[PDB]
Design an enzyme around this catalytic site. Structure first.
Site, PDB file in Angstrom:
ATOM      1  N   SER B 592       3.407 -12.000   3.266  1.00  0.00           N
ATOM      2  CA  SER B 592       2.395 -12.711   2.446  1.00  0.00           C
ATOM      3  C   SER B 592       3.027 -13.375   1.241  1.00  0.00           C
ATOM      4  O   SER B 592       3.966 -14.159   1.392  1.00  0.00           O
ATOM      5  CB  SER B 592       1.259 -11.796   1.987  1.00  0.00           C
ATOM      6  OG  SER B 592       0.657 -11.166   3.093  1.00  0.00           O
ATOM      7  N   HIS B 702      -3.205 -11.616   9.799  1.00  0.00           N
ATOM      8  CA  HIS B 702      -2.246 -11.479   8.719  1.00  0.00           C
ATOM      9  C   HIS B 702      -1.483 -10.155   8.721  1.00  0.00           C
ATOM     10  O   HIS B 702      -0.355 -10.071   8.199  1.00  0.00           O
ATOM     11  CB  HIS B 702      -2.886 -11.737   7.366  1.00  0.00           C
ATOM     12  CG  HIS B 702      -1.891 -12.016   6.284  1.00  0.00           C
ATOM     13  ND1 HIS B 702      -0.869 -12.931   6.432  1.00  0.00           N
ATOM     14  CD2 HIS B 702      -1.754 -11.498   5.042  1.00  0.00           C
ATOM     15  CE1 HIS B 702      -0.158 -12.975   5.320  1.00  0.00           C
ATOM     16  NE2 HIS B 702      -0.675 -12.118   4.460  1.00  0.00           N
TER      17      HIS B 702
HETATM   18  C1  MA9 Z   1      -9.716  -3.696  -7.536  1.00  0.00           C
HETATM   19  S1  MA9 Z   1     -10.974  -4.271  -6.585  1.00  0.00           S
HETATM   20  O1  MA9 Z   1     -12.192  -4.302  -7.368  1.00  0.00           O
HETATM   21  O2  MA9 Z   1     -11.131  -3.428  -5.414  1.00  0.00           O
HETATM   22  C2  MA9 Z   1     -10.610  -5.766  -6.118  1.00  0.00           C
HETATM   23  C3  MA9 Z   1     -11.467  -6.875  -6.239  1.00  0.00           C
HETATM   24  C4  MA9 Z   1     -11.050  -8.144  -5.799  1.00  0.00           C
HETATM   25  C5  MA9 Z   1      -9.775  -8.316  -5.233  1.00  0.00           C
HETATM   26  C6  MA9 Z   1      -8.946  -7.196  -5.119  1.00  0.00           C
HETATM   27  C7  MA9 Z   1      -7.583  -7.202  -4.587  1.00  0.00           C
HETATM   28  C8  MA9 Z   1      -7.133  -8.151  -3.684  1.00  0.00           C
HETATM   29  C9  MA9 Z   1      -5.801  -8.029  -3.274  1.00  0.00           C
HETATM   30  N1  MA9 Z   1      -5.234  -8.918  -2.365  1.00  0.00           N
HETATM   31  C10 MA9 Z   1      -3.826  -8.662  -2.069  1.00  0.00           C
HETATM   32  C11 MA9 Z   1      -3.149 -10.006  -2.065  1.00  0.00           C
HETATM   33  C12 MA9 Z   1      -3.895 -10.862  -1.052  1.00  0.00           C
HETATM   34  C13 MA9 Z   1      -3.050 -11.987  -0.608  1.00  0.00           C
HETATM   35  C14 MA9 Z   1      -2.237 -12.672  -1.509  1.00  0.00           C
HETATM   36  C15 MA9 Z   1      -1.432 -13.698  -1.058  1.00  0.00           C
HETATM   37  F1  MA9 Z   1      -0.651 -14.365  -1.918  1.00  0.00           F
HETATM   38  C16 MA9 Z   1      -1.441 -14.039   0.275  1.00  0.00           C
HETATM   39  F2  MA9 Z   1      -0.667 -15.046   0.680  1.00  0.00           F
HETATM   40  C17 MA9 Z   1      -2.242 -13.355   1.187  1.00  0.00           C
HETATM   41  C18 MA9 Z   1      -3.049 -12.311   0.734  1.00  0.00           C
HETATM   42  F3  MA9 Z   1      -3.836 -11.628   1.579  1.00  0.00           F
HETATM   43  C19 MA9 Z   1      -5.240 -11.254  -1.638  1.00  0.00           C
HETATM   44  N2  MA9 Z   1      -5.912 -12.222  -0.801  1.00  0.00           N
HETATM   45  C20 MA9 Z   1      -6.056  -9.973  -1.744  1.00  0.00           C
HETATM   46  N3  MA9 Z   1      -5.018  -7.014  -3.758  1.00  0.00           N
HETATM   47  C21 MA9 Z   1      -5.494  -6.115  -4.642  1.00  0.00           C
HETATM   48  N4  MA9 Z   1      -6.768  -6.213  -5.049  1.00  0.00           N
HETATM   49  C22 MA9 Z   1      -9.358  -5.949  -5.559  1.00  0.00           C
END
Ligand code: MA9
Lengths: 726, 726
Positions: B592, B702
């Site tokens: 990613s 993914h």
């Molecule tokens: C803390 S929460 O209220 O549950 C909480 C609330 C909202 C979001 C998120 C959350 C989202 C993410 N992601 C991880 C990185 C992901 C990613 C980044 C990227 F550059 C790529 F190319 C592909 C990819 F899937 C992102 N789409 C989601 N990581 C941690 N936390 C969390």
């Protein structure tokens, strides 16, 4: 010693092959192109006043891709804005330039995004197709009359072929035919209403945010085919207020009973049109011969002028039923058809007599009928020296069939054994094109008594360059299996030494009626692998191969993926017995069908091959198109041939790839052999836990032909081979 | 000596990690699953009568993938027919089993293809979404009352999230929220009408003749976003004849001026709902506090109840504004927000006073607020020993902020430095989950005076197996740059020898608020690389990394693809000076965002890295989604940040890959980081004549997580690395 034929050389095209592309505008003259200026040549003597100056269009304001002079001699068509579609299809823009008044024609211009333009064969009448509709232009500077009104993008095609007809039956976008003097314009209409669409992503320039989904009407084996209709219109009795009557020719009844194709259309006289139809089971074909009825204003396809051409042991024709050649009166014709012995030869037909007479015979075949005069029939065949990989020009005397002459065999035997020919308008002159095993040679002749007029292109330049570089030599020969000869070539490294063991690459196509073993002189990737890398590149024409008669060509009928691959494995073993071949280092590769064969061979568990490459392979027959697949395989239904469709996939052979090193290459924009096919291969190999190498080529179609992708792939393949082999 | 941690081990999961997944059904009891039978446990003493027999559902007639007991204790919901959609979304079938009459309820059952089902938090009321519409089920045996009527597939979403809200704002499919006693059901509705669709081929099983085009509403950076609305309905006053009134909450006015999101919803009392919205420029967020008006029957979001959270140095919150935690009366709340100093800490807010008070401070951050009693707030933070990679549980005394206690720090310091926690219903007991550096340890505690009741899982089985095998050790530490510490970890081979030079792999993510240097015990692919192949796998958290304050995390604000890649480059260099690192053999890899940083690093022409692997990378930011990309990059417009959008693509660095060995892997059915991204990378590298390895995984998203593809990819990557390294 000195330098070899390197990879760079092949990619950067350092050793250029000269051609002599001429176009006959009459019986006494032709135009030779250039980069500068179209010149006109007199065939008798060789003098040549410049036809139209290269300066004429430097300040035209567009790159001009192609030229096309009306037969009148009065106008030039100017092609520009060329936008490639399929193998033959493309769109373009067009201006008409009047040679007389040295003056561009500006009003009533042909529209941009035009799919096809064609002159009439005599005057300066134009027919063009635009947004799937036919338009006629009696005078270049006058308006166009519309002929059809049902043009719908992707649905109804008027005067042009749909995807499958372009590829599989006509080998051309064009689906209109003028009559010899240009009274009649005959055309086909194709209907893709109910044809399924292949869909795939096209990514384009980085700047495009969302990938676009290209979608094209494409019948896979067993699916709903396009329907065809056929029409003819009089281009002399159209008014500009009455919309214009197109007369439909229908049937014949032997085709209407079920799914059918139209596969040939050939004018005979001013008022005779010949048509060939072919059943979806490509077993049975009919020729119709229709005269115009002055009286009723419609076309009579007289019963009893019809000619059945069938096959009890395979499919009709090489890829399609052959084209008829009509004598001047139109009351008889010559066409190539299969022997009683299995061999393709010329038959003399009288238009209302079913029993044709063979004018040629023998264990060799006729390739093509090149010309017909009042006393002589001209043809290419592989008769000389019993070599199915040779091509020569012959004439047969129409009044005594025993008296046939070779016109090309003896001019230079050591240099020249693969010929092709281009004739002036009443065939008083001809250009012969020798293409191997020596350097391509272009020469001019007069027919009156076959006198060699002069040499047009000897490639002495290239010959001079290629004497300071250690070229590979080529060997053509045959091996026997089950009392049959099978031809094969080998590209041999320089200073070949039969006491040393060499790695071998097996270069394969092996598709029905193919021939990889011939006399053409080829300057390609194999040349590099032999010259620089000291590899023996070899090809072999096993069962299903063409030009040696039907017992061979039809051996794989209803059985693709059997003998042709059994035979390539067979070849390999045979070469590995030959003593100069390290059998720990045999590889195999192929593109297209050849990819399929390669894949199928690697999956066989033969144990012969250490590694292999498959480029854009077919992987199961149901993914490929109806017209081609069905020709050899029948329909993939329980009642017909579903069983072997199923039993002949690459996927089922997955488990055996553990024993080999595999490279799977494919372009994501392949409209021909959809990427889907390599996608199913990889899925299979993942599913059974087999490691392999892969490479997609984003946006490239079946040729992966772009400047840079062509270089990338060949570079990539060289790396994989060199490592498999060192 | 003895055996190492092999690849097969990681892939066949031979060393199993035991968990203790419990679910608290009350304040005194929990259920521990098994593969057998759900048992019920009493927290005080540990006795446990079987809750419902394993045999109850062997003759059920379907595999049962998940369970869910109503709080009442009177029903279990049984999930089956599970069909995965995106990261959180999936469809399922459901049956309700009444515990008390030992009998499945079969009339008025929940329809299949149900997108989401949820209990009331008190009784046995049901809310479920089916065909994008909300349905409520007061009694399991009784009919459902429809709530919304505008459900349209891929157009209007009621009670569920569209693709981007699921991924980027809520981290869930669920978009309904019950009031705490279950009178009110609040829900969001999303509208994808004018959202562009990403389109791609899915191939399916070999039997499928034509590939299907999947197409999903997906806003790429700068595109038309989904609009949102919010509603609440009273589930006590619905009849079955009048269709049912949802009252809409709107605004706030600071949001309606342009594009915005809804990013939090948390109930406060029976009649207070807290809502957080956030401008499309994710700079500026508002919290609404709306009380239900008995009289008018609508919801007052009275201004002066609203609380602005902004950032002058970057974006609001970690990935989103944090969640508030309301005190019982609902007149005050705690939430994590950023310091004056830059650091994330807990603020005490009185619902109608702007000026919140910090109850914690310091150069560390609070991770999450775990629980709130009348005298104690419980939370996780990385305060212990100044270790941003550590996690611990603390309690702060509500009546004196000076008196804060560590509950997890000291139980086993050698083994346990990374904790998480699960509390009983009124927080009378807690399970602590220690997850490293030693083996995962699960224990039970009582809150009354934080006494350790007992050990629930020590993983001694796993310990016994792992002492027969040469495991790697792990080192956590920091380097200094620009007078700041930046943490890093290294997985070191067994029998490490500082006098020997080892190859190094840099394991990278480096995305905004990431942390790859921590105390968690991981048994994965790096473990194999270090154990069997004697490779140092190392990770580093440079700028843009989280949990270390805003100085660090916001360094890459409006500037992705800058400092984070310059800092990985920088760590590599520093590691290579360490003496035990062969710098002829440094590699780098990521998935990613980490795939993006990898490609960016290899393209940089640093000269440090021999080779690299990118799995499913981003390649340019306009290809990734609006909510995530824009959070860090702003809008891709001339007025905003277009210039750096363009200046930061992988493609533009193409030329520099001549210096390295590159492996580019991507699943064809990636709905998240579209294949397109790798397709444009390969195109660039072909365009500039650069050799590289590739591998597509057909129909993998993914995670490339299916059993076989997971195995294939890691095997394929070990081959590439081994080769780059021997
Ligand atoms: C803390 S929460 O209220 O549950 C909480 C609330 C909202 C979001 C998120 C959350 C989202 C993410 N992601 C991880 C990185 C992901 C990613 C980044 C990227 F550059 C790529 F190319 C592909 C990819 F899937 C992102 N789409 C989601 N990581 C941690 N936390 C969390």
């Amino acid at each position: 010693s000195r330098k070899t034929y390197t990879l760079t050389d092949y990619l950067k095209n350092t050793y250029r092959l000269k051609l002599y592309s001429l176009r006959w505008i009459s019986d006494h003259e032709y135009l030779y192109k250039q980069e500068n200026n179209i010149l006109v040549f007199n065939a008798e003597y060789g003098n040549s006043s410049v036809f139209l100056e290269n300066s004429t269009f430097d300040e035209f304001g567009h790159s001009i891709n192609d030229y096309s002079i009306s037969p009148d001699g009065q106008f030039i068509l100017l092609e520009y804005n060329y936008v490639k579609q399929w193998r033959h299809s493309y769109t373009a823009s067009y201006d008409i330039y009047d040679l007389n008044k040295r003056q561009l024609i500006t009003e009533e211009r042909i529209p941009n995004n035009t799919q096809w333009v064609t002159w009439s064969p005599v005057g300066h009448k134009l027919a063009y197709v635009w947004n799937n509709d036919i338009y006629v232009k009696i005078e270049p500077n006058l308006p166009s009359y519309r002929i059809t009104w049902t043009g719908k993008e992707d649905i109804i095609y008027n005067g042009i072929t749909d995807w499958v007809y372009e590829e599989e039956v006509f080998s051309a976008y064009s689906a209109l035919w003028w009559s010899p003097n240009g009274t009649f314009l005959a055309y086909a209409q194709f209907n893709d209403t109910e044809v399924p669409l292949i869909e795939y992503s096209f990514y384009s320039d980085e700047s495009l945010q969302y990938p676009k989904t290209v979608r094209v009407p494409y019948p896979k084996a067993g699916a709903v085919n396009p329907t065809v209709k056929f029409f003819v219109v009089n281009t002399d009795s159209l008014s500009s207020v009455t919309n214009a009557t197109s007369i439909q020719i229908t049937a014949p009844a032997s085709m209407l009973i079920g799914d059918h194709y139209l596969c040939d259309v050939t004018w005979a006289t001013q008022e005779r049109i010949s048509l060939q139809w072919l059943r979806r089971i490509q077993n049975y074909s009919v020729m119709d011969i229709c005269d115009y009825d002055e009286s009723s204003g419609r076309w009579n396809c007289l019963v009893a002028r019809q000619h059945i051409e069938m096959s009890t042991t395979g499919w009709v024709g090489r890829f399609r039923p052959s084209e008829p050649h009509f004598t001047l009166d139109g009351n008889s014709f010559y066409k190539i058809i299969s022997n009683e012995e299995g061999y393709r030869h010329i038959c003399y037909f009288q238009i209302d007599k079913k029993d044709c007479t063979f004018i040629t015979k023998g264990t060799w075949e006729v390739i093509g009928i090149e010309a017909l005069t009042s006393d002589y029939l001209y043809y290419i065949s592989n008769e000389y020296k019993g070599m199915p990989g040779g091509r020569n020009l012959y004439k047969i005397q129409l009044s005594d069939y025993t008296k046939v002459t070779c016109l090309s065999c003896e001019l230079n035997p050591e240099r020249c054994q693969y010929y092709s020919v281009s004739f002036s308008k009443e065939a008083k002159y001809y250009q012969l094109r020798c293409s191997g095993p020596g350097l391509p040679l272009y020469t001019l002749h007069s027919s009156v008594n076959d006198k060699g007029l002069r040499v047009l292109e000897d490639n002495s330049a290239l010959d001079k360059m290629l004497q300071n570089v250690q070229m590979p030599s080529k060997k053509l020969d045959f091996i026997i299996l089950n009392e049959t000869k099978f031809w094969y070539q080998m590209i041999l490294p320089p200073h070949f030494d039969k006491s040393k063991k060499y790695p071998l690459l097996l270069d394969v196509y092996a598709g029905p009626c193919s021939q990889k073993a011939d006399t053409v002189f080829r300057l390609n990737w194999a040349t590099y692998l032999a010259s620089t890398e000291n590899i023996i590149v070899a090809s072999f024409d096993g069962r299903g191969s063409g030009y040696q008669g039907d017992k061979i060509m039809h051996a794989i009928n209803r059985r693709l993926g059997t003998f042709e691959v059994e035979d390539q494995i067979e070849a390999a073993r045979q070469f590995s017995k030959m003593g100069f071949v390290d059998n720990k280092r045999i590889a195999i590769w192929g593109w297209s069908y050849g990819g399929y064969v390669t894949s199928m061979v690697l999956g066989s568990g033969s144990g012969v091959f250490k590694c292999g490459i498959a480029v854009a392979p077919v992987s199961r027959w149901e993914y490929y198109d109806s017209v081609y697949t069905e020709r050899y395989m029948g329909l993939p239904t329980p009642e017909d041939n579903l069983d072997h469709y199923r039993n002949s996939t690459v996927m089922s052979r997955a488990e055996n790839f553990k024993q080999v090193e595999y490279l799977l290459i494919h372009g994501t924009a392949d409209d021909n052999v959809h990427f889907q096919q390599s996608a199913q291969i990889s899925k299979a190999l993942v599913d059974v836990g087999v490691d392999f190498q892969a490479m997609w080529y984003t946006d490239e179609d079946h040729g992966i032909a772009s400047s840079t992708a062509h270089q990338h792939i060949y570079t990539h393949m060289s790396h994989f081979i060199k490592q498999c082999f060192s």
